[PDB]
Structure 1
Amino acid sequence: QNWRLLRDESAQLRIADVLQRKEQFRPLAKRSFIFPASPQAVWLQVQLPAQKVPSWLWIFAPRVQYLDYYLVQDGQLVRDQHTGESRPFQERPLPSRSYLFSLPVDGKPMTLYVRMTSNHPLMAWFDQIDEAGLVGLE
């Protein structure tokens, strides 16, 4: 129940606003979603324990225009990345243009937040992967 979702139909919520609304996140029945095209912002919240081996959050979000990634550890914002198809000029390694975010092995648990918007149907698949998952990616 640590993979949770919040639909922000206002599209106005920022990271600070979302952190005030943690109780509004509800558990996902699968690590993916699809919604008809709308101006909503979909937020993902993933709570993870301290990690022992290299791992990544993988996201395949075709046609997502704005994707914002935030990592929180010990109540503080430790990572803050703005990407998506409407943020060009960033070179990504994978042919699929999937997104990878490295999850630190630093003795502390974490919470990740991802904001996604599109003018197209809003869809993504996502999961935590280790090195073994990484080397088979395309």
Structure 2
Amino acid sequence: QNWRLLRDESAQLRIADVLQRKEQFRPLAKRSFIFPASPQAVWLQVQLPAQKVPSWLWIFAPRVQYLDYYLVQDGQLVRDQHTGESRPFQERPLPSRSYLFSLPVDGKPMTLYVRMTSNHPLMAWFDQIDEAGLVGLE
């Protein structure tokens, strides 16, 4: 698959450092994970073909303190957004307090990198959704 993960036990790898280790990402048997409380960073990588309709990456990450989001196209970082529960504000309209990232329609594929860290268990679910899913989030 293209929904891949990477465990950073040092927690020091950055976006450049992670893009220098693309061959260490490994396929996920499912679209979620959970890890007991540790100071490890969990990096998710998603390669998508060219998109034809407006869509969003949804991530329900309860108890997740820091979450950094990076988007890669033509070897460039087009978007770089840092948020998280430990991050303040970031208010958005989902009762769930879930996360959504718009996925562009620009005639090129894309690679997503997401870093998650916490002092609690690293529960997380994620998927790509269209408008049929967007209108039903809570």
C-alpha displacement at 1:32, in angstroms? 0.3
> What TM-score does the superposition give when structure 1 sets the normalisation length?
0.99
Please identify, of 82-91 and 111-120, the stretch whose mean Cα deviation from structure 2 is larger: 82-91
Deviations 1:25-63 (A, max 9, x none): 000000100001000000000000000000000000001
Tell me, what secondary structure is at the counterpart of 2:123? strand
Which residue of structure 1 aligns with residue 78 of structure 2?
Answer: 78
Q: CA deviation at 1:88?
A: 1.0
Given the two structures, how large is their TM-score scaled by the length of structure 2?
0.99
User: Which 4+ residue blocks in structure 1 deviate beyond 6 angstroms?
Assistant: none
Total equivalences in the alignment: 138
Q: Look up the SS of the partner of 1:122 in the other structure.
A: coil
CA distance in 2, matches of 1:37, 1:71: 27
Deviation at 1:89, TM superposition (A): 1.5
**Could you tell me how far 1:17 is from its partner in structure 2?**
0.1
Query: Residue in 2 aligned with 1:24?
Result: 24
- Write the deviation string for residues 87-125 of structure 1: whole angstroms up to 9, x where unpaired: 112211100000000000000000000000000001100
CA RMSD of aligned residues (A): 0.4
Percent of aligned positions that are identical: 100
Q: Give the SS at the match of 2:18.
A: helix
In the alignment, structure 1 segments of 5+ residues that lack a partner are none
